[PDB]
Amino acid sequence: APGICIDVDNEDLFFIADKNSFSDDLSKNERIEYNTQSNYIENDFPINELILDTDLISKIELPSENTESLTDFNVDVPVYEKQPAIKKIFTDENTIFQYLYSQTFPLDIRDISLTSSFDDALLFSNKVYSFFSMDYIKTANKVVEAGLFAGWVKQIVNDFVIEANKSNTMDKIADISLIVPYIGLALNVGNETAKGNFENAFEIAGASILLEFIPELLIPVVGAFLLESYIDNKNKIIKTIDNALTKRNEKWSDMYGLIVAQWLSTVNTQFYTIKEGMYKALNYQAQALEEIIKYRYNIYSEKEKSNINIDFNDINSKLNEGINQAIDNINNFINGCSVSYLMKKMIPLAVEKLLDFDNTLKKNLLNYIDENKLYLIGSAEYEKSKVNKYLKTIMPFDLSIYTNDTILIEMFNKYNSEILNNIILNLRYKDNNLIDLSGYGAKVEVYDGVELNDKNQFKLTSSANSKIRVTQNQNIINSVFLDFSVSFWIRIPKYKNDGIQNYIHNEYTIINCMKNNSGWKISIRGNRIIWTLIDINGKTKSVFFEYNIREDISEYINRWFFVTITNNLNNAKIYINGKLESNTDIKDIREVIANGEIIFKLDGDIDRTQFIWMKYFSIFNTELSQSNIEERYKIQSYSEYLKDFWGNPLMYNKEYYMFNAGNKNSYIKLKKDSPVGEILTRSKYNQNSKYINYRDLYIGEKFIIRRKSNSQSINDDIVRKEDYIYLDFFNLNQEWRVYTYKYFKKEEMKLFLAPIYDSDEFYNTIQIKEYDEQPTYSCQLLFKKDEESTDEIGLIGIHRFYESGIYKDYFCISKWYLKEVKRKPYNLKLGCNWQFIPKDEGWTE
């Protein structure tokens, strides 16, 4: 009788209510009349009212118990019988039950070891499956000397606690608040969550991937209303119209309650079983470690035990607090997933059918007003506007209507307090394409003319096929009372000097969301970015942001910046890089249609070489606060790598002109017949116009960054923080290098620029830095003696040197900068702050 067979209690299985459990009554018709009332039954009753109700207990005395004998014994006696206690089945699946079995071991076995192979744990008695990291497994499996043991015991216990407490995403820009990333490996529950990277799979598909079963919902087509004729009475016709609208609300509420009942008995049940699984999985992993520790302690000789101080109750106690911390995280994560499935995968499907019912009722009610217009005596038109006003605003879902359980209310209130759950469209790059990671499943189709890269940047060109079409989910809930935000990053190219008039006057649309000549629009006119609202009547409001085109150095022109647009009752606002720039009042407008197709396309009287870059386009169904936007600005600014002047990633083996944030109109030139950096002044814009001014950027020596050692990750050519590098530059044909002199007696000293040669009195090793904690494209350059040494010589910068005559600025190293870089606010205008400028298509001069 071979084959691995696991005995599973019926108790540990998933309770999933059949579709036949739920009522179909919402499909029946209602007859509406002058005196028709609403039907609600609250499942509550106050206990204090029950305890002090004088009417509850009977005042009437109990009649005598004695009576005539029973002679009619007729009665139905139920009959019971037993059934078998085992049912044998064969399955290909390896889910929760199978994965937990792999984490146990028999009582009599000695010398267990941990493994990441599920199949080996099943085959071999001494192998126990584990879902923690490769490093934990290896450290748990290590055998050591007696003197090192108590150190190893302290370490692996601590490592257990750390591994259990992992509660964050590795990708920091992903829009995910809480996650426990080892859940997939622990149970393989749902759609193969042990295979592949679980955190990655969760970002794409959400809570759905943990469900072992996707239930089939009952969502009935709400029945017709049959309004009564009262040809005599005006009063009763208006009451019938009022009773129709009031009964429409009952049908919304009952539909929501039908969805909540299915949620709790088919989805929230599954997530409960998952929480119980993780509790057991975690306890098995602690039991395995306690068995490994105990076994290895007893291999040592009896005298070696008295050189090793171990407390086994302390170990059990310390692992248990680690489990209890982990269970808190898991309960929060899973509770969040359950509410998420309710709000994204169930509620909207009900709303689809309820809007369809509202539509059929509106047609019915208006025809009823029209049939009775004579008996309404010209009040008719007041009733038609009441009907259209009442059926415009839809009933919002509130779980607290359908339950008084505080655990469920707090789940729901936590969900609504987390701003990431307000995202309704979130365009991101996966597998050479753009997709929606919001969870609402919007359709996205990118045509061939849009260039994409894996840094989430997309390019809209003037070509006809450079287009994206997003089709929004129609079942998300804000027509009249706007409450929504839009955010994205953008890099807008510089004007052409010859064609300044086409630039400054010709407005062109980039993103267009319109239906029946109503919606919203993002457009650009030269150095102005514009947000526009358009209502059903054709009315217009705008708010804009304009950046200065007469600036020595612009922070906006052809450089990546962050835009956020916010809309409520009063205002439409534009924020740039987290700060409020503009504000327009929008009360005058009424009813904007935001459910249209979104078209990403250049449209207008444009130059044929015009283009736009964009990144991280997303839409929120609420008005983002200043904090939310500033937080989002910082999060989307994060990288392991450094950035160049334009905001793109900084690269090895790329030609760069150097810029200094403290001396902005300055540049490095190699001095005539001398090996030092001479500092000149930048040549400004030559001639003509009046509207334009800038300073030349492609000027000074052409630098280039070179990596020190080949023994590293040679996958990409991207410069990261704390990397060791040589700073080189071109001199006619050859490549020269930047050095510092090993003797450095004064505070500031000129730098030695010479060809590539191994000298003995000059250091060449630079460490590239980023001392600024806020977002920036400025980096710093630190000289040391060599890589291993913890002493730091000084930072590269600029100083005004005195040299006698019988003052001039030089490219230097300085000690004074190291005493300033760690001050609280951080000086952006420090002379050690450099930025690298490559030659870019969107800046010509």
């Binding site: 017949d673 001398s674 090996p675 030092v676 002199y741 000293m749 000129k750 030695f752 010479a754 060809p755 040669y757 000298s759 040299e803 006698s804």
Partner: peptide, 18 residues
Amino acid sequence: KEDAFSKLKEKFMNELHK
């Protein structure tokens, strides 16, 4: 050719003491 490096080095050592 190494003496191109030495002739630059003295010009730096001059520029330093300047």
